[PDB]
């Protein structure tokens, strides 16, 4: 599964 690493308040979703 990928990893989510929200930023100032907003979600980022990184595909590994």
């Known amino acids: 599964r990928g990893v989510?690493?929200?930023h100032?308040?907003?979600s980022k979703?990184?595909?590994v």
């Open 4 to 6: 989510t690493v929200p």
């Open 13 to 15: 979703d990184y595909s």
């Open 8 to 10: 100032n308040g907003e």
